[PDB]
Design a binder for this molecule. Structure first.
Ligand SMILES: C=C(/N=C/c1c(COP(=O)(O)O)cnc(C)c1O)C(=O)O
Ligand SMILES: C=C(/N=C/c1c(COP(=O)(O)O)cnc(C)c1O)C(=O)O
Lengths: 333, 334
């Protein structure tokens, strides 16, 4: 309680960057939150902390109860660290094709990690195994990130608020916001906050072009944008209450992430995707529209992946016409 | 200059943690700066930013000039990122037995990474190659971290000042400070700041027991505490102006780092070493003495190392009598 007050100093309050770049070849800018500046290096720390703090406040978790979750990586890492801080055993189910770094990290935080193959049902299968564990261990706390409102609320109260306060400090109206969807907590929570302040802002969820599950409603394929598009549309995301889906090719996302690293911003693959997405929305709203996005994590968990290999440029990539020019401002509140 | 003012928001202002633990039935606490909360994830971001900012101010670097450095990893990473932001090519020479993650990261930031074997002279060899590059290429900027006062100054003006302000806000006098030595910038700079505010504080440099270069003045051996004890005593560190050397076994450092990760603090190997060193100093000064240290980076670059394997506990390890109890406070002045 008092504890929860000081433990919040481990999450959030991250830099907002103004990134200037040339696009075929007009001067453009985009605003981005750098979420590596967090306990375990991702935006998910804000959500795990908020989720457990509220669960404590509402008596939904007992002391020493296991926390059990299914993850693409970061949320598992986040609950493993914060659970260990708060004295909980943590058990994480994760698909076996997520980066090796994610598995090692979860184990380093003292959690039990159970990998789940395509054969055992992947993401939906991971989720079912968490529920089977809860049935067989009735003290279990299930954060239920793919459906729990605490997830979107974390970002309404945390990062979304920082974003509205920071843009207001620059006397800029927010015209749009883009984020890749895994659970949708990011887009929904930030979206809610932004729209209460700017009722015409466009809030766009993002998907891989290779696995366009949101825009089609059903299509699922392999893609390399780790963390988003986890083989189903999560209950938390409400596509009818968001603006149009933005779709980015996973190679375009990679190239963009590589370029961001060569201007000093070592980001994960979904950060590259978000950057491209923000540009796509800016292209629709006007070259000077004020678009915000987020960089969910750094590049450290992606050294084993195609982020570190040469990616073939295709004719429809936006990245090929982008030259990053400068970090034009950094705010930290 | 206006640029340097806003770019500083990418470094520093990191959490100070109060960590409570049991050591032989006594309740102990130790204060630690969590330096993962930085541009590239390490304390070295503060130093690279400071070094280049001052170099710019004093006209010691030209626009587009190459920044060339020899590193155990983090400082190379830090200069690579900050150099890229400021429009500089970066060239890094690094021994080939540093973690693979370090090499990939430096490249990811667009720097040229040249690896240097034990046969080619290791760290001193890496340093010589930076100087040969500068002699061949006359507008080369050499941050020269093993000897440049800007390095210790970074920490005098940055992290050392945060530490003094934070401990003063808790009404606590600082009795000691411990940090592993690579360049010595951390210990010298923080030490200077702490001693100006607490003239009786002990400032102790730390080394690996397995490669006790500081306390012997000569011995060099293989050890796994990446980032410290880089095969020589750096000119920057002044052992005669510091308090006694603290030596930690690299297995003991590993176990301590593993334990920290199991209480939610995913830290590098030198962070484990520093925690043990703080305890050793506390043991000498008094169970209640106020000891401060730093955790230079997270565990992400160490997934390929013994940090992720089972370490054999030896009888002389301090880690084996430590039980972490809780994160008792976190301060953050942003
Ligand atoms: C679903 C998860 N992650 C989402 C994620 C996302 C998508 O954010 P939301 O899950 O809040 O939609 C974007 N980028 C990265 C690196 C991510 O790790 C998870 O870690 O379980
Ligand atoms: C010599 C360097 N590293 C220092 C370092 C140190 C030693 O810090 P000082 O250089 O300030 O002594 C401790 N821990 C870690 C993880 C480090 O990377 C360098 O990164 O090149």
């Amino acid at each position: 309680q008092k504890k929860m007050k000081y433990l919040e100093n481990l999450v959030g309050k991250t830099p907002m960057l103004e990134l200037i770049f040339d696009y075929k070849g007009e001067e453009r800018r985009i605003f981005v939150k750098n979420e590596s500046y967090n306990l375990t290096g991702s935006i998910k720390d804000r959500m795990a902390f908020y989720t457990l703090k509220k669960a404590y406040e509402k008596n939904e978790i007992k002391k020493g109860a296991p926390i059990v979750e299914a993850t693409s990586g970061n949320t598992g890492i986040a609950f493993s660290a914060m659970g260990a801080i708060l004295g909980h055993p943590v058990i994480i189910y994760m698909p076996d094709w997520m980066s090796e770094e994610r598995k090692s990290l979860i184990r380093s935080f003292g959690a039990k990690i159970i990998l789940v193959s395509r054969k055992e049902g992947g993401f939906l299968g991971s989720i079912e195994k968490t529920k089977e564990f809860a049935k067989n261990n009735p003290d279990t706390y299930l954060p239920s990130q793919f459906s729990n409102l605490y997830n979107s609320e974390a970002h309404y109260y945390g990062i979304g608020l920082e974003i509205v306060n920071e843009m207001k400090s620059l006397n800029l109206n927010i015209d749009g916001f883009v984020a890749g969807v895994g659970t949708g907590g990011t887009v929904m929570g930030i979206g809610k906050r932004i729209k209460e302040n700017f009722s015409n802002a466009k809030i766009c969820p993002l998907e891989p072009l290779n696995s366009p599950t949101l825009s089609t409603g059903y299509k699922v394929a392999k893609h390399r944008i780790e963390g988003i598009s986890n083989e189903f549309i999560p209950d938390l995301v409400k596509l009818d209450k968001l603006d149009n889906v933005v779709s980015v090719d996973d190679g375009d996302a990679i190239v963009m992430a590589q370029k961001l690293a060569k201007c000093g911003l070592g980001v994960g693959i979904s950060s590259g995707a978000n950057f491209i997405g923000a540009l796509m929305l800016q292209n629709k709203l006007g070259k000077d529209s004020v678009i915000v996005t987020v960089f969910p994590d750094d590049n450290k968990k992606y050294l084993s992946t195609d982020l570190m290999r040469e990616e073939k440029v295709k004719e429809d990539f936006l990245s090929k016409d982008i030259t990053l020019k400068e970090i034009k401002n950094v705010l930290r509140v």
